[PDB]
Amino acid sequence: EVKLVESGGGLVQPGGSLRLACATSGFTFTDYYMSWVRQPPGKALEWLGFIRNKAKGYTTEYSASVKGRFTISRDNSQSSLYLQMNTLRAEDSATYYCARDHDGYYERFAYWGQGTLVTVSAAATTPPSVYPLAPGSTNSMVTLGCLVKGYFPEPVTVTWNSGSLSTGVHTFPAVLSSDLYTLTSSVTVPSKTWPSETVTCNVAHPASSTKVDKKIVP
Amino acid sequence: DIVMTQSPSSLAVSAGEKVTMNCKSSQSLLNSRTRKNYLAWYQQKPGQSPKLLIYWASTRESGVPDRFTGSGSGTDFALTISSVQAEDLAVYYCKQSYNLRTFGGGTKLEIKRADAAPTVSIFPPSSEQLTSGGASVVCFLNNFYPKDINVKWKIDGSERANGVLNSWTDQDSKDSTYSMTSTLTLTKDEYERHNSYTCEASHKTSTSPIVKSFNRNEC
Numbered sequence: 001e002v003k004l005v006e007s008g009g010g011l012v013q014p015g016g017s018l019r020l021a022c023a024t025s026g027f028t029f030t031d032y033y034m035s036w037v038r039q040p041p042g043k044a045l046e047w048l049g050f051i052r053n054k055a056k057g058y059t060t061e062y063s064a065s066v067k068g069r070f071t072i073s074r075d076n077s078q079s080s081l082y083l084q085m086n087t088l089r090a091e092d093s094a095t096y097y098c099a100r101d102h103d104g105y106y107e108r109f110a111y112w113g114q115g116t117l118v119t120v121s122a123a124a125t126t127p128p129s130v131y132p133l134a135p136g137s138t139n140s141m142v143t144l145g146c147l148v149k150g151y152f153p154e155p156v157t158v159t160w161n162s163g164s165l166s167t168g169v170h171t172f173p174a175v176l177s178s179d180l181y182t183l184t185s186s187v188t189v190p191s192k193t194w195p196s197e198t199v200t201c202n203v204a205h206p207a208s209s210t211k212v213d214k215k216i217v218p
Numbered sequence: 219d220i221v222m223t224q225s226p227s228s229l230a231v232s233a234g235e236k237v238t239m240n241c242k243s244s245q246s247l248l249n250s251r252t253r254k255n256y257l258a259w260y261q262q263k264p265g266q267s268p269k270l271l272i273y274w275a276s277t278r279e280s281g282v283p284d285r286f287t288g289s290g291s292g293t294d295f296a297l298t299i300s301s302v303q304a305e306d307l308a309v310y311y312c313k314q315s316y317n318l319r320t321f322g323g324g325t326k327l328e329i330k331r332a333d334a335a336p337t338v339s340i341f342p343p344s345s346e347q348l349t350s351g352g353a354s355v356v357c358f359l360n361n362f363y364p365k366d367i368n369v370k371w372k373i374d375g376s377e378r379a380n381g382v383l384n385s386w387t388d389q390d391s392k393d394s395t396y397s398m399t400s401t402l403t404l405t406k407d408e409y410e411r412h413n414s415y416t417c418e419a420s421h422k423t424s425t426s427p428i429v430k431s432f433n434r435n436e437c
C-alpha cells in the first residue's frame with residue numbers, strides 16, 4: 001500500500017509562517033520527485049513546487065507564485081516531505097496536497113495525500129455548538145439531523161453511528177457569517193430502526209480538538 | 219511559462235451518453251527526445267483528492283475504467299468518456315509536466331437526470347440551544363433535481379426573509395440529485411412570540427409547494 005499523509009494544517013495569522021509535513025510509506029522514497037499542490041476552497045488545483053530524487057541530487061523548483069516564499073525539503077531517513085510557508089496571506093488559504101512525482105521515467109502524479117486545510121485569518125478559533133435535530137411526525141423512512149453551529153476555522157467532520165451509517169447522509173457545506181461557520185447534516189433511515197436502534201452524530205473540530213457525540217432522542 | 223486552458227468550464231450529460239472535454243497548452247508538450255506528450259488528466263470527485271486517470275496524453279492508468287480515453291498531441295488534448303456513469307461526477311484537470319508542472323482550470327462534469335421532487339423535513343430548535351439563548355429552525359430539502367429550488371419561511375402564516383441562509387450539497391454520486399438545507403436563525407425572545415413555523419418548498423416538479431410545519435404549542 002502506497003500511503004501519503006499531510007499534517008500541519010490549520011489557522012495561522014496573516015504574516016505568519018507554517019510548516020506542513022507529508023508522511024509516506026509503501027514505496028522507495030528516494031527514487032521519487034515529490035510535489036506540493038494546493039487548492040483554495042471551490043477553486044482550481046495549483047502546482048507549487050517539487051524536490052527531485054536522489055539521482056538528481058534532491059534539488060528544488062517552485063512556481064513563480066511561491067518561489068522565494070515557500071521552501072520544500074525532505075527527510076530521506078524518514079521518507080518524509082516538508083513545505084515551509086512564510087509571510088502567509090489570504091490567497092494561501094487552501095487545502096495542501098503532497099503528491100508522488102517523477103521517478104526518472106514516468107510522467108505522472110500516481111499518488112496523492114488526503115490534503116490538509118490551511119486558513120489564513122486573524123479571527124479566533126471557536127469550537128462548534130452541536131444540536132440534535134429530532135424528527136416530529138409515520139412513513140417508511142425517517143430523517144434526523146445535527147446542527148453544527150458557530151465554529152472557526154474549517155473543517156469539521158460529521159459521522160453517524162461512528163461511520164456505520166454512510167448511505168442516505170447529507171452533510172451540507174458550511175456557510176460563513178460573522179467570522180463563524182455553521183453546517184448541518186441529515187441522515188435518513190428506516191422507521192423500524194429509530195428510536196428502537198440509536199442514532200448518534202459524531203462531530204470533530206480539529207482546530208479546537210473538539211469531540212462531540214449527540215444521540216438523537218425522541 | 220506554459221498556459222493551460224480547459225473547455226468547457228462545465229456541462230451536464232445524462233448517464234450512458236458520451237462526453238468530451240478539451241485542454242489546450244500555449245506551447246507544444248511533445249518532447250522530442252522521448253517522443254511523447256507530457257500531459258496528464260486527473261479526476262477529483264466532490265470532497266476527495268485528485269486521482270490520476272491518464273498520462274502521456276493517452277496512457278490509461280491501471281484501475282481506470284476503459285470508458286476513459288485520452289487523446290491529442292502538441293497543443294491540443296481531449297479526455298473522452300464513451301458512456302457516462304453517475305459516479306463520473308467530478309472536476310477533471312489536465313496538467314503539463316514538460317516544463318515544471320501546470321494545471322488547467324478544470325472542467326466540471328455534472329450529471330443530467332430525470333426531474334425529482336424534494337423530500338422536505340423541518341426541525342424545531344433544540345432545548346440545549348434554546349436554554350443557551352438562540353433559536354435555529356432547520357429545513358432539509360433532500361434528493362431533488364434539477365438544482366434550482368425556492369424556500370419560503372412563514373411565522374404564524376406571514377413570510378419571513380430575514381435570517382434565512384441556504385446551502386446546497388454537491389450532486390450525489392449515486393442518484394445524481396441535489397439536497398439543500400435552509401436554516402432560519404432567530405433570538406429565543408422572538409421565537410417564543412409565535413407558534414407556527416412553516417418551511418415551504420417550491421420546485422418545478424409541482425405547481426403546488428411542498429409545505430412542512432410545526433407548532434410550538436405542540437412540542
Ligand SMILES: O=C(O)[C@@]1(O)C[C@@H](O)[C@@H](O)[C@@H]([C@H](O)CO)O1
Nearest residue numbers: 052056102107249315316317318
Ligand atoms: O526538470 C526536471 O528535473 C525534469 O526531469 C522533470 C521532468 O518531469 C521533465 O519535465 C524533464 C524535462 O522533460 C526535461 O528533460 O525535466
Ligand SMILES: [Zn+2]
Nearest residue numbers: 059060061062
Ligand atoms: Zn534548478
